[PDB]
C-alpha cells in the first residue's frame, strides 16, 4: 500500500479545519494564551459560520494566483529508509484486505440471532464498541453481517452500536513485501499580517495534535514529530511583504506490496521404497 502523505494531510486538514473554525468556543480554547487584540481580530475575520473571510489550503507551485490573506501551503520534502525486515517481509495474509473502516450500525433482530449490517463485506472484525462476546454468544461473521445469540441478549434488540472492521477484497493469499520509510513534509502558513500567521500556526498545531487519534495515522503514519522554523519574509518584491513560519512534519510509514501465491496443497503421496 503506497502512501501519499500529502493527499492524506489535505483530506485530514480540510474538514477538520473547517469544523474547528466553525465554532468560537474551540477557537477561544486554542487562543487562550494570546492577547485580546489579535485573538479577537482573528475571530472576527475567520471564525464563525457566517465568516466573510475564509482560509484555503493547497499544494505548491499553483499556476493560478493564490490568496495570501491566510493560506496553508504544503510541499512534499525529503524521505529516507530507516528500517528493514528479513527478506523485506512485513506480514502474511490469507485473505486480501483493504482499508480499515469504522461504521455505525444499529442492532437488528433475526429469528435466531441479533445482527448488525454493514456497508461492505468483512475480512476481519477488530472491535465492537463496549462489547466482549463470550462463547455463549457465539460471535459469527457471515459476509456483510455479524451476529450473536438472540435469547440471552434480548434486552439489547436496538443497541445503537458502532463497528471497527476491515474490507474484504479477495479470497487469495500472499505475502507482504516492503520496508519502512521515514518521511519529512513541510507545511507553512502565509499571510501579509504576521499576527494572522501566528494564530494560523497555533491552529495548525492544534489540528496536528487532534489528528493523532485518527484511525489512518494510528495504523499507517505512526511516530509524528514536529519542527518549526523562524518567522521570515517570504517575499519582499511586492508592495508589502509575505510573512510565514514553515513547519516540518515527520512520519513513519510502511511502503509495501502484496505478492500473491498460487501454491495450495490438498493431497499427500506418502509411499515407501524398495531395493
Amino acid at each position: 500500500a503506497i502512501t501519499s502523505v500529502d493527499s492524506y494531510l489535505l483530506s485530514e486538514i480540510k474538514p477538520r479545519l473547517n469544523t474547528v473554525l466553525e465554532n468560537c468556543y474551540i477557537i477561544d480554547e486554542v487562543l487562550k494564551d494570546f492577547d485580546y487584540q489579535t485573538r479577537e481580530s482573528f475571530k472576527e475575520a475567520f471564525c464563525g459560520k457566517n465568516a466573510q473571510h475564509e482560509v484555503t489550503v493547497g499544494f505548491n507551485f499553483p499556476k493560478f494566483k493564490n490568496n495570501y490573506e491566510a493560506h496553508y501551503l504544503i510541499q512534499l520534502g525529503q524521505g529516507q529508509e530507516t528500517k528493514n525486515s528479513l527478506g523485506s517481509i512485513q506480514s502474511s495474509y490469507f485473505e486480501a484486505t483493504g482499508d480499515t473502516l469504522v461504521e455505525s450500525s444499529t442492532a437488528i433482530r433475526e429469528d435466531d440471532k441479533l445482527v448488525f449490517t454493514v456497508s461492505k463485506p468483512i475480512g476481519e472484525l477488530i472491535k465492537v464498541e463496549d462489547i466482549e462476546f463470550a462463547k455463549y454468544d457465539n460471535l459469527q461473521v457471515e459476509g456483510n453481517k455479524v451476529s450473536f445469540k438472540y435469547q440471552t441478549n434480548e434486552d439489547y434488540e436496538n443497541y445503537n452500536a458502532n463497528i471497527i472492521f476491515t474490507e474484504k477484497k479477495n479470497d487469495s493469499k500472499g505475502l507482504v513485501k516492503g520496508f519502512t520509510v521515514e518521511e519529512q513534509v513541510t507545511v507553512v502558513g502565509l499571510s501579509f499580517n504576521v499576527d494572522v500567521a501566528r494564530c494560523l500556526d497555533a491552529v495548525l498545531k492544534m489540528i496536528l495534535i487532534s489528528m493523532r487519534d485518527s484511525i489512518e495515522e494510528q495504523q499507517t503514519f505512526q511516530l509524528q514529530n514536529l519542527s518549526f522554523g523562524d518567522i521570515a519574509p517570504i517575499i519582499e518584491d511586492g508592495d508589502s511583504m509575505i510573512f510565514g513560519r514553515p513547519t516540518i512534519i515527520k512520519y513513519t510509514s510502511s511502503l509495501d506490496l502484496d505478492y500473491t501465491i498460487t501454491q495450495d496443497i490438498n493431497k499427500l503421496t506418502f509411499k515407501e521404497r524398495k531395493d
Binding site: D130, E132, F133, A134, K135, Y136, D137, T152, Y156, Y159
Partner: protein, 49 residues
C-alpha cells in the same frame, strides 16, 4: 487469585461476557461448583491359603 487461594477448584476463563450501555454494564460468567465425596461401595472375597 481465588484459585491461588484454593477457594475455587476450576473455572472457564473464556466464558466471561461484558457489555456496556451508556451508564450501565452487564457482566456474565460461570464457575464450576465444588463436589464433595458421598458414596463408597465395598465388597469382600474370602479365599483359602
Amino acid at each position: 487469585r481465588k484459585k491461588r487461594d484454593n477457594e475455587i477448584q476450576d473455572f472457564p476463563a473464556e466464558d466471561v461476557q461484558v457489555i456496556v450501555e451508556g451508564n450501565e454494564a452487564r457482566i456474565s460468567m460461570t464457575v464450576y461448583p465444588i463436589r464433595s465425596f458421598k458414596k463408597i461401595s465395598v465388597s469382600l472375597v474370602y479365599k483359602q491359603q
